[PDB]
Amino acid sequence: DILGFRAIEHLRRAKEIYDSLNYHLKNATAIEKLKEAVSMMLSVNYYPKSIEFLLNIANSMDKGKLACQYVANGFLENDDRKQYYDKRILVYDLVFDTLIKVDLRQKSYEAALKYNDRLFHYHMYDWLVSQNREEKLLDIETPFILPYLMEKAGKISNILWVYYSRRSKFFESAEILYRLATSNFDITLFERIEFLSRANGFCQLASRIQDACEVAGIQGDILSLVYTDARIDSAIKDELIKTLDGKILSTSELFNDFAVPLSYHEIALFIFKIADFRDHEVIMAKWDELFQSLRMEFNNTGKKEDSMNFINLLSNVLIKIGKNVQDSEFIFPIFELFPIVCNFFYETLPKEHIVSGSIVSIFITAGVSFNKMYYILKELIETSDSDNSVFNKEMTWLIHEWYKSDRKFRDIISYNDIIHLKEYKIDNDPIEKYVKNSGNNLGICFYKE
């Protein structure tokens, strides 16, 4: 009571004016009263040691660590008495209310920070996030910053856009953006992926990250299609869109709840690759649909235009999904597929609109090497007892396409020994001949630039 009036006087004399400052410090050791005392401290620019004062007082009453236990329950019953917590917050708030006023102003911040009190920092930080000084957190090097961010991990995206940033160590950063992308709060794919584009960049984890990138991408495709697709209402779309941007989904869900009812057959195919499906029948069953749908939209008038136009778009669709699934031999059985393609070509287009090379150029452009494409075709020719009039024209086009594309190839067979082959034959084979003399070493795979 009186001791308080005396302390207030000790600070009153200081105001009229270092000694009285010490008399105020000691005066403490001995609520709205406690505010007043400070207000006068500051009149003489007494901030830094004012804070310590306030803090020391906060620690002097709890003496100690009882509030901490109250929080471990965070209860409304007496828990480890709430009173202690409710008290310190008031002091804390005053430490903030004063910090605000410092708006040489850095010597007052590095006091609070450079001061052992978890609860305080936990609350200083909370106080920083409130007035959006979130980025300032990224400039804090206290032993209590780390845990704080960790605990508050799960607008938390700020805490996390703060965390993966925070970590200048890549492992930890990535492990964060991963969960960031696989989380529950609404976060568009474009960011879910940029989280992965980032997370990936830093690098079992790789495993789960890549998988994610892949499945995510598929949704992006399905999503892009739902736009163009005219079989949908914009609200349906939207509902769907909500589901697509919103998270990564079970493949079977992606397949059964989308690719099928929406007959996006390329998708289902690409899915097959990632999931590592192999059942030839079902794989081919899906290829069949692909071609059969393609057929529906075509308009055969016998004109050289509609033919080419379709040839193009057809070659286009194929090369796309081709690039995506070519590296798989079960999703991309070139031996079973190339025929079917040619077949698809003639079964639809006027024979006179089909040019030698139109079919094979697709696989080549898809990402298949000249080397692989060659042997498969050669087999296809010597395996069948039929005419092979079609494959021959293609092979003829292919060999001519290789020579004029690879110097390494012209270095084995002369321009003379190439202009001869107008239609392919096992004995006319310029490659077969060069092998019966120099060996079967055609050098590394030659792809299309």
Domains of the chain by start residue, with CATH: 2-132 (1.25.40.450), 133-202 (1.25.40.440), 205-448 (1.20.120.1880)
Biggest CA-to-CA distance, the chain: 118
Cα dihedral value 171, 172, 174, 175, nearest 10 = 110
> What tokens were used for 45?
């620019």
Cα separation values, 310 from 43, 116, 315, 352, Å: 84, 74, 8, 15
**Which DSSP symbol is given to 330?**
T
Residues in the chain: 449
Using CB atoms within 10 Å of the CB of residue 437, give its burial: 0 to 12 exposed, 13 to 18 middle, 19+ buried.
exposed
Distance, in Å, from the CA atom of 252 to the CA atom of 255, rounded to the nearest integer, reads: 5
Q: Are 362 and 313 in contact (CB under 8 A)?
A: no
If one counts every other C-beta atom within 10 angstroms of the C-beta of residue 125, the result is: 22
Closest CA to 205 of 175, 225, 243: 175
Method of structure determination: X-ray
Helix H or strand E segment including 317:
helix 304-325
At residue 271's C-alpha, the angle toward residues 265 and 275, to 5°, is 145
> What tokens were used for 265?
């057959």
Residue 135 phi/psi, 5° resolution? Answer: -65, -30
**Which DSSP symbol is given to 259?**
I
The 3-state DSSP class for residue 357 equals coil
C-alpha 197: how far from chain center: 5
Q: Are 127 and 96 in contact (CB under 8 A)?
A: yes
If one counts every other C-beta atom within 10 angstroms of the C-beta of residue 106, the result is: 9
Phi-psi region of 229 (alpha: psi -120 to 50; beta: other; left: phi over 0): beta
If one counts every other C-beta atom within 10 angstroms of the C-beta of residue 15, the result is: 12
Q: Are 243 and 237 in contact (CB under 8 A)?
A: no
| Residue partners of 391: CB distance under 8 A and separation at least 6 | 342, 377, 380, 381, 384, 424
If one counts every other C-beta atom within 10 angstroms of the C-beta of residue 230, the result is: 5
Q: Are 341 and 318 in contact (CB under 8 A)?
A: yes
The 3-state DSSP class for residue 143 equals coil
